[PDB]
Write an enzyme that holds these catalytic residues in place. Structure first.
Site, PDB file in Angstrom:
ATOM      1  N   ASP A  43       0.563  -1.187   0.490  1.00  0.00           N
ATOM      2  CA  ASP A  43      -0.083   0.263  -0.269  1.00  0.00           C
ATOM      3  C   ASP A  43       0.491   1.317  -0.272  1.00  0.00           C
ATOM      4  O   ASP A  43       2.101   1.369   0.645  1.00  0.00           O
ATOM      5  CB  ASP A  43      -1.124  -0.079   1.182  1.00  0.00           C
ATOM      6  N   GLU A  65       1.129  -0.594  -5.240  1.00  0.00           N
ATOM      7  CA  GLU A  65       0.668   0.265  -5.289  1.00  0.00           C
ATOM      8  C   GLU A  65       1.135   2.065  -5.165  1.00  0.00           C
ATOM      9  O   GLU A  65       1.041   2.618  -4.762  1.00  0.00           O
ATOM     10  CB  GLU A  65      -0.675   0.449  -4.840  1.00  0.00           C
TER      11      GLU A  65
END
Ligand code: NA
Ligand code: NA
Ligand SMILES: [Rb+]
Ligand SMILES: [Rb+]
Ligand SMILES: [Rb+]
Ligand SMILES: [Rb+]
Ligand SMILES: [Rb+]
Ligand SMILES: [Rb+]
Length: 480
Positions: free
Chosen positions: A231, A261
């Protein structure tokens, strides 16, 4: 044996906070495996700011819905025991499990602390816009309720370097802790995008570096993962993400897939990060994401020949994870860039029937997003899964030779009898196109797995066939 993997993000932003999600996952395993899903990306499974937190408002990476903290025992998805039960189900059903990992920040601190701080220019963090002064930031973490199980590390302001809120004078500012530095290297948007939200972790501290490495291993071992969904890595100093990754593969016996990400509609930016990573992980194909978006937004005028142009999969199909949407792009969310129902079928066909890239099915699309009256596309997507699972093999031939109508084909593979497919679509008026599919498939009669076109195509002696499609539709002819 064989291959063709398909990942699925098993959650959407507006799921119900009934803590029954882990259980659904458990009962859904077989169905998903059978439908062609080989891997599941679960959401942050640790205790967040509150019970209804989606997971990114991470409070205690060690509380997997097991301790009564932050007003709840279970997480939005359920209890630790139910999650472990789900994972067991997925395993016995041959589905890899990737965990969502949030290390950029922490939120829901138990108490505030006096900290010398400075306000920085939001559009340029490098620049202060106020002198240093004491603010009361929320940085104290004692995890009361866990009783030091699994780890007794306590977090304190000095483990961080910034927050966006001051409890003393109660105001919002991007506060850089005085005498601390923004992490580096990190995305240079706004000058230095180290700070995003919550209490930003400063990785310069060796004890921080080890607590997250140590935790990561604990996490990986406790859940028996097979990879991670990293993340907000564009906000996390690159060097550390890299170290962390290498550290996990070092401690774990099993292989570990890693998709990060790095959210930015700019393939170069991702290539740069991938250089720095020494390509030891893959990255969600965000440009592709926005490509689909731009197309869904523009309509037929959009030149279909440039649909893959700029994408990541286009240049490094080996380190790209393809998808159409997610919890951040769904309507109303922070990164909204939602692909409309009309184009969504084409996008899915593009990342599901082509050879390059690791495609990811979005829970929101599959089962629908009730909150926004978005229908479940299980039917449209299952057919494509069937395509990918059983027909998307062998040499590929591309035909992005027209602005509206374009397609591609796969000759099939000896190892997989009857495999082979021809994908064609148009984002504008319908049409037809002659595409090669392998002389070895001559005389076969192919039909559209999606049922969007009644045409029955016969393969000629040379291995050629003419495939059709109506306007704004996609078809995937196979030898069924
Ligand atoms: Na950061
Ligand atoms: Na067009
Ligand atoms: Rb508590
Ligand atoms: Rb190892
Ligand atoms: Rb999108
Ligand atoms: Rb074949
Ligand atoms: Rb159909
Ligand atoms: Rb047939």
């Amino acid at each position: 044996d064989g291959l063709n993997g398909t990942m699925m993000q098993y959650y959407e932003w507006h799921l119900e906070n009934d803590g029954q999600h882990w259980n659904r996952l458990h009962d859904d395993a077989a169905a998903l495996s059978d439908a062609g899903i080989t891997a599941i990306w679960i959401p942050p499974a640790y205790k967040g700011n509150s019970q209804a937190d989606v997971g990114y408002g991470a409070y205690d990476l060690y509380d997997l819905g097991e301790f009564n903290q932050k007003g709840t025992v279970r997480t939005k998805y359920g209890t630790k025991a139910q999650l472990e039960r789900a994972i067991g189900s997925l395993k016995s059903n041959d589905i890899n499990v990737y965990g969502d990992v949030v290390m950029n920040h922490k939120m829901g601190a138990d108490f505030t602390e006096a900290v010398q701080a400075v306000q920085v220019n939001p559009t340029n963090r490098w620049q202060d816009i106020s002198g240093a002064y004491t603010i009361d930031a929320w940085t104290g973490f004692d995890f009361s309720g866990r009783n030091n199980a699994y780890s007794d590390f306590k977090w304190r302001w000095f483990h961080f370097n910034g927050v966006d809120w001051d409890q003393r004078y109660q105001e919002n500012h991007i506060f850089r802790f005085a005498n601390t530095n923004w992490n580096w290297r990190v995305d240079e948007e706004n000058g230095n995008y180290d700070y995003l939200l919550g209490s930003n972790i400063d990785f310069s501290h060796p004890e921080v570096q080890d607590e997250l490495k140590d935790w990561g291993s604990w996490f990986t071992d406790e859940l028996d993962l097979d990879g991670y969904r990293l993340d907000a890595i564009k906000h996390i100093p690159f060097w550390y993400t890299s170290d962390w990754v290498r550290h996990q593969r070092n401690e774990a016996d099993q292989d570990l897939f890693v998709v990060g990400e790095y959210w930015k509609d700019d393939v170069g930016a991702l290539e740069f990060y991938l250089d720095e990573m020494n390509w030891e992980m893959s990255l969600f194909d965000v440009p592709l994401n926005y490509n689909f978006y731009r197309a869904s937004q523009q309509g037929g005028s959009y030149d279909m020949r440039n649909i893959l142009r700029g994408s990541l999969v286009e240049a490094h199909p080996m380190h790209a994870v393809t998808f159409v949407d997610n919890h951040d792009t769904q309507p109303g969310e922070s990164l909204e860039s939602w692909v409309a129902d009309w184009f969504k079928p084409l996008a899915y066909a593009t990342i599901l029937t082509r050879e390059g890239g690791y495609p990811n099915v979005f829970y929101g699309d599959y089962y629908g997003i009730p909150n926004d009256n978005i229908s479940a596309k299980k039917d449209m997507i299952d057919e494509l899964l069937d395509a990918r699972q059983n027909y998307a093999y062998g040499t590929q031939h591309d035909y992005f030779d027209h602005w509206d109508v374009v397609g591609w084909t796969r000759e099939g593979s000896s190892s997989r009898p009857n495999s082979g497919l021809a994908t064609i679509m148009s984002n504008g008026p319908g049409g037809s196109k002659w595409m090669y599919v392998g002389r070895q498939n001559a005389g076969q009669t192919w039909t559209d797995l999606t049922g969007n076109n009644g045409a029955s195509v016969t393969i000629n002696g040379d291995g050629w066939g003419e495939f059709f499609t109506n306007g704004g539709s996609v078809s995937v002819y196979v030898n069924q």
